[PDB]
């Protein structure tokens, strides 16, 4: 029923008289009932990684043996809720304790059981109807944006013997009650699910729809997709500065789950202050991002066990909202801090490490976390397709590319927005290094582009070719000299400068460049590549001819055209509507064609 | 309160470096405090690092020399280390264990606070947006500090990091559009360094507002494990209870990490990098993360650790983890120190992660962020041009490359360079930055918006 503490060493308690305890089962250690997890068994003695400070835990202290593993309460109240790494509600703790401190062993319910929720059952349901895991048997009007579809827990099934009528219910009220094999199971609106178990789905479908970040470089050169899997450096200036809040403010995603695995104190404070104040335009109204975002905060000084469970809690919440039928963009602030937690716990366990001290199962754990992403035909009879798009941040020691966690990540993730330290130093934001950064979803996105942006794929191909040619030419230019360059080489270099400075360079703090629509991105790239092709055509055609044309001639003739192409990035979608921006870009193309016709 | 008589054990079973392993212990309490009376009456203190049934691995702060089994009396206080804290701790000097060394009386406790500290709910932690006008241009201009922020001073052996810290201490103050109370924690600082800091505080008159915790080099090497926690508990008392804007200086997190490594090696734990404990990240975070403000309160705890990077290596575990935790770093450069620049702050590798929200209109000025960004960019390009010149020669440099080199020279001569007793307001720092940026034409200042170039460049 309950064991006794035999020894203590930091977070690693060792409790005796735990004969039947199960691995990874939950226990409450001490007289304050500190949450712990059984990570090892030796006869009748269980090693317990404790999720709170173990100071003052004495040998012989009772150890309650709870039968469940680390699990999260999934139900109404998640949206707009700030959570500790193990689902403890920080805001509710503050309100209940009336103090700024997290009391040790605090046991406040993750989901409030006093808030009345507007519950409306699925009308077609009735007493005796057959239901299974995933069946949306009711909807809670959580807020103006998210309709919380109350799903029957996975691995549940049977005949509905009672469905509550429409009304207002608590998170603890028995709302449904179904019989199977003669056993009656009573279900409220909150379901407990282990954080380390993948939520089942009918089928993981391929990802074939872009997840539009705000950045032109990421959207065009290295696309991401819904249900995707991305690695993004945690370098300053980029990352939390712009990309996370842009995904929050606007994207194809319908929910956001942001897990601060190892966040610094004041930076986590920055997130918790900014996010409740961000707003987005939905159905002609400005609504708080908190109405569809949830935060799983975990500062660096919180227990390492909670730091390890933070990622799992976040991904389980994301999977729940995916099963709901939504697109959940999840952002892990640092999987590097998760790996550090794993390394420290492995050391405390006295396991043999792999290279650089990390456990040899770091890659397996990273895969078990990432591969929980994807676009899925959610379980449950009412057909729906959800997705979970993970954006995990990796911050190796001193920008190391051979870092074990970065290598394990690159072995799993399909998108990687590598960091250019040179660009970061020059203050070229985003600092993506387009030469080693990659996205494997380009092939899957061919169908989407060839139906909505038919012309964008050749533009992307030509832009990448131009950038690589610039990379190859800059070495020669700075090794030897700029005098021997051909006219076509000059076109490539100057078009590469144009693209890099005014298509791949996006300042995320300006009103006009906070979020760049993909129509804007594709139109800009189209203008730039059209200019490239036409200038190269002029140069090559006039080569071996009396009236030779050169890059200097072109620039001197149409410095105005170059300036307009440079200022193209300033179009503001908010006031310069889509039609206005497209018309302006078409006018720029017309001016380019007219000027080159005059030149020719 | 604990009324039960304490238990005294003459059952010492083993001494191994700083560890004293007792047996036959009645219900050992982890992290409990013990008082070891040696055979000759010398009294020491220890902390139970781990317990296993009837065993207890005490860790003696003063060192285990002179201890013998069968005669050392370890009295178990029955409670975790609860340091006494009082406002009159300001203007006092304490050794690493908190005992007076200024010939004053023992601290008359206003309260007894756990040294490990009370974790702070992130939901009620204020984001520090108030700038600290340190008066050092290399920091204010480009790596500004926000009140409540954690920002270490990475340096090496022989660099003037003590001088920079003393300058920051004596010049720290808010930007003019509440004086700081200093809590000092010296770990392994030689007598010269400790005397320098104490004399500086006395000369500048802040001693009434300064609370020192000195653990010199000759002092026990395991006492610096608790010294920073004592300092931060006192800082939390003065800030979140007495409503004082505190500034916490920690001289040698390198020495603290060496103490951690020593204890871990004595414990024969599975090592991390370079032999440091695998939990060094968490141990360092439990110290750094105690800065910042909180809702309802009026005080704050600005934290400025100081590190000695071994072999000037910013990839060493101590600086690496301290960067992972703290919000930025101020980097002291051996090349600059050799070239006789002061402060030798290399602004390329150093950053401040709260500077973006500390600077700007209303806080300091409209052009602060753009000026800093352009200064950093021009400095980096100048360093690259210098590296190229070292190989190809100046005669192959273009006019713009020569402009970058001139900017680098004047930037290290006018912006970074600064008298030890000279505090430049943020506005003066920005004026110097603009004078240096005017070297380049407006067309070469790419990171400065035209709306600000047309307002500040022409002057």
């Amino acid at each position: 029923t309950f064991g006794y503490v035999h020894g203590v060493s930091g977070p690693v308690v060792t409790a005796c008289d735990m004969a039947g305890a199960a691995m990874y089962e939950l226990v409450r250690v001490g007289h304050s009932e500190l949450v712990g997890e059984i990570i090892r068994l030796e006869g009748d003695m269980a090693t317990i990684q404790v999720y709170e400070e173990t100071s003052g835990v004495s040998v012989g202290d009772p150890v309650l043996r709870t039968g469940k593993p680390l699990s999260v309460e999934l139900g109404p109240g998640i949206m707009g809720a700030i959570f500790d790494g193990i689902q403890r509600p920080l805001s509710d703790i503050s309100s209940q304790t009336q103090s700024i401190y997290i009391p040790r062993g605090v046991n406040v319910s993750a989901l409030s059981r006093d808030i009345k929720w507007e519950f409306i059952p699925s009308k077609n349901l009735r007493v005796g109807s057959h239901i299974t895991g995933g069946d949306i048997y009711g909807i809670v009007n959580e807020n103006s944006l998210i309709k919380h579809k109350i799903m029957l827990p996975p691995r549940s099934r049977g005949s509905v013997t009672y469905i509550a009528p429409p009304g207002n219910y608590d998170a603890s009220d028995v709302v449904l009650e179904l019989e199977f094999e003669g056993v009656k199971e009573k279900l409220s609106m909150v379901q407990v699910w282990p954080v380390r178990q993948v939520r089942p789905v009918t089928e993981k479908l391929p990802a074939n729809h872009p997840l539009l970040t705000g950045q032109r470089v990421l959207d065009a050169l290295f696309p991401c997709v819904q249900g995707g899997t991305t690695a993004i450096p945690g370098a300053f200036g980029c990352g939390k500065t712009v990309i996370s809040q842009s995904l929050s403010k606007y994207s194809n995603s319908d929910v956001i789950i942001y897990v601060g695995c190892g966040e610094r104190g004041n930076e986590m404070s920055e997130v918790l202050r900014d996010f409740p104040e961000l707003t987005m335009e939905v159905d002609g109204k400005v609504e708080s991002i908190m109405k569809r975002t949830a935060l799983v905060a975990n500062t660096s000084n919180m227990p390492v066990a909670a730091r390890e469970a933070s990622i799992y809690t976040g991904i389980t919440l994301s999977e729940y909202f995916r099963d709901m039928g939504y697109h959940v963009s999840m952002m892990a602030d640092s999987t590097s801090r998760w790996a550090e937690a794993l390394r420290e716990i492995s050391g405390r366990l006295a396991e043999m490490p792999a290279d650089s001290g990390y456990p040899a199962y770091l890659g397996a754990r990273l895969a078990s976390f990432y591969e929980r992403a994807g676009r899925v035909k959610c379980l449950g009879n009412p057909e729906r397709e959800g997705s979970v798009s993970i954006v995990g941040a990796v911050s190796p020691p001193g920008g190391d590319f051979s870092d074990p966690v970065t290598s394990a990540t690159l072995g799993i993730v399909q998108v990687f927005w590598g960091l250019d330290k040179k660009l970061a130093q020059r203050k070229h934001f985003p600092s993506v290094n387009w030469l080693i950064s990659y996205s494997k979803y380009m092939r899957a996105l061919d169908e989407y582009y060839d139906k909505h942006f038919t012309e964008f794929v050749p533009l992307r191909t030509k832009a990448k070719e131009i950038l690589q040619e610039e990379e190859d030419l800059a070495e020669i230019v700075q090794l030897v000299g700029k005098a021997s360059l051909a006219e076509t080489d000059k076109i490539t270099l100057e078009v590469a400068k144009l693209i890099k400075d005014d298509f791949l360079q996006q300042n995320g703090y300006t009103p006009y460049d906070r979020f760049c629509p993909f129509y804007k991105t594709v139109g800009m790239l189209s203008n730039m590549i059209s200019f490239y092709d036409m200038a190269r055509r002029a140069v090559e055609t006039t080569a071996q001819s009396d009236n030779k044309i050169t890059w200097s001639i072109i620039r001197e003739h149409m410095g105005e055209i170059l300036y307009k192409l440079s200022s193209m990035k300033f179009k503001d979608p908010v006031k310069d509507g889509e039609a206005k921006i497209k018309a302006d870009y078409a006018q720029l193309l017309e001016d380019m064609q007219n000027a080159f016709r005059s030149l020719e | 309160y604990l009324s039960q008589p304490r238990l005294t054990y003459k059952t010492v079973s083993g001494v191994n470096g700083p560890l004293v392993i007792l047996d036959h212990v009645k219900f050992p309490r982890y992290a409990e405090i013990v008082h070891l009376t040696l055979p000759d009456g010398t009294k020491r203190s220890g902390q139970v690092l781990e317990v296993s049934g009837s065993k207890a691995v005490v860790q003696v702060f003063e060192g285990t020399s002179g201890i013998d089994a069968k005669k050392t009396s370890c009295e178990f206080t029955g409670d975790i280390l609860r340091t006494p804290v009082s406002e009159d701790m300001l203007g006092r000097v304490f050794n690493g264990s908190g005992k007076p060394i200024d010939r004053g009386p023992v601290v008359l406790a206003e309260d007894f606070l756990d040294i490990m500290g009370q974790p702070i709910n992130p939901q009620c932690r204020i984001y520090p947006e108030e700038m600290i006008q340190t008066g050092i241009s290399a920091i204010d201009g480009m790596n500004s500090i926000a009140r409540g922020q954690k920002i270490p001073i990475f340096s090496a052996a022989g660099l003037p990091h003590n001088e920079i810290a003393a300058q920051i201490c004596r010049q720290a103050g808010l930007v003019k559009k509440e004086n700081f109370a200093i809590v000092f924690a010296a770990m392994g600082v030689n007598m010269e360094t400790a005397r320098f800091f104490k004399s500086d505080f006395e000369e500048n008159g802040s001693m009434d507002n300064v609370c020192l915790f000195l653990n010199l080099a000759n002092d026990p090497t395991i006492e610096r494990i608790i010294t920073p926690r004592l300092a931060l508990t006192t800082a939390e008392f003065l800030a979140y209870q007495c409503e004082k804007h505190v500034l916490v200086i920690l001289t040698d997190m390198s020495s603290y990490a060496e103490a951690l490594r020593e204890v871990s090696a004595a414990r024969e734990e599975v090592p991390g990098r370079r032999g440091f404990p695998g939990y060094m990240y968490t141990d360092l975070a439990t110290i750094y993360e105690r800065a910042g403000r909180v809702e309802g309160r009026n005080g704050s705890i600005t934290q400025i650790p100081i590190l000695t990077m071994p072999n000037d290596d910013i990839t060493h575990p101590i600086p690496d983890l301290t960067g992972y935790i703290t919000e930025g770093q101020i980097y002291v450069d051996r090349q600059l120190h050799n070239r006789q620049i002061y402060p030798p702050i290399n602004v390329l590798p150093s950053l401040s992660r709260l500077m973006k929200s500390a600077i700007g209109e209303g806080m300091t000025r409209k052009d602060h962020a753009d000026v800093s960004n352009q200064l950093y960019a021009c400095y980096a390009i100048g360093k690259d041009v210098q590296a190229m010149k070292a190989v190809v020669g100046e005669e192959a440099l273009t006019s713009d490359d020569l402009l970058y080199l001139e900017f680098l020279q004047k930037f290290e001569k006018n912006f970074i360079t600064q008298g030890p007793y000279e505090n430049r307001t943020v506005y003066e720092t920005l004026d110097i930055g603009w004078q240096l940026l005017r070297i380049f034409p407006k067309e070469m200042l790419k990171r400065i918006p035209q709306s600000t170039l047309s307002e500040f460049y022409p002057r």
Binding site: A350, M352, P353 | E268, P271, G275
Partner: peptide, 19 residues
């Protein structure tokens, strides 16, 4: 490698002590 080998030897010795 030396540190890990030393740790393995100590773990073996501790296991023998417990046995």
């Amino acid at each position: 490698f030396y540190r890990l080998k030393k740790i393995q030897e100590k773990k073996k010795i501790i296991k023998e002590k417990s046995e």
